[PDB]
Amino acid sequence: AVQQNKPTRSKRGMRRSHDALTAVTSLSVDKTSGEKHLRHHITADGYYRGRKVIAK
Amino acid sequence: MIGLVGKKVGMTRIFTEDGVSIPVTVIEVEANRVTQVKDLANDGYRAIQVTTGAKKANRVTKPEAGHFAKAGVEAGRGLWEFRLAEGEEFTVGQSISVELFADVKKVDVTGTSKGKGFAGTVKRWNFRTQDATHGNSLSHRVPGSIGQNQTPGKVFKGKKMAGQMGNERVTVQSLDVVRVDAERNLLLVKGAVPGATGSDLIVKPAVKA
């Protein structure tokens, strides 16, 4: 339930070796407006693949 | 003797004339195409690698496409192997599948079993649950002891605990062949074979027989 010896900062970093964020590294570019977006998502002005889908 | 690769169509019933109503599994066995023959010169053993079914030619990668392009190109859903021992058979992909099972009487069917996920000890092994009500703080389906105090001081390397159940290769042995249909590409065997509907089955003649 409790520890008998303090884990060192080496073992702390070894456990956090998999606690690492991954980036998108590839944004899609819409074909009507040149702005970028997440793949398969609305293009933050209301564009999907070539169509103005949401007016706001 | 070599076997074949089929898929599990499902289970049904064969009503015989005496009213015996034997439970059968239907295995669709399409024609197996010998894509490779392995001998004692290239390898240390003799076998045939076959394929079955079809793939849509866009999910076939270029190494797979070249491997199928050798020895006659009809791509299949996978590749399997059967080791062959004494009899010699010629090395082209067969036209009718189940005609070598037409004269056998019992088969072993290997299939990837249905996955039960993370299963407990009571499901995975046949562990007795503890008491439901006589006291029993928080300990009904949990495992009890897992060892023997200080003298081992450890848990042994084969201890039955919870974990992944199913989703594994498993063979049911000596299943009686009920019907062989060359025209419908069907093998009806008596009983239940591992896996779900549409899963691949390696069906071979019985080694215990």
């Binding site: - | 169509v9 064969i14 009213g19 239907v26």
Partner: protein
Amino acid sequence: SNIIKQLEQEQMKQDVPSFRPGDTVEVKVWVVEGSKKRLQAFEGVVIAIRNRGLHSAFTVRKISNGEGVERVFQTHSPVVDSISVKRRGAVRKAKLYYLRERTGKAARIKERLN
């Protein structure tokens, strides 16, 4: 599937008459003692399945010698060669378990194709 129900339809029998639950039917079944085989009749009210293809079964409940005998039969089995309509009963539901666990109460008859 399509591969199955081909086997089921080539094993199914087409001589099965129309029955509803609450009907009192008589079922002739083949019984075998030695080398001889004969027909034995089982008569009673029906707690049916509706047609599950080849895997169809009707329950028939009888009172034979003072106690209830409940027997299901597979409809397309070869041991069941004749099912006779006999009485034609009138109930409101599909399974008659509550309407059989009591004794001395019988299903009524109506003539609206029941």
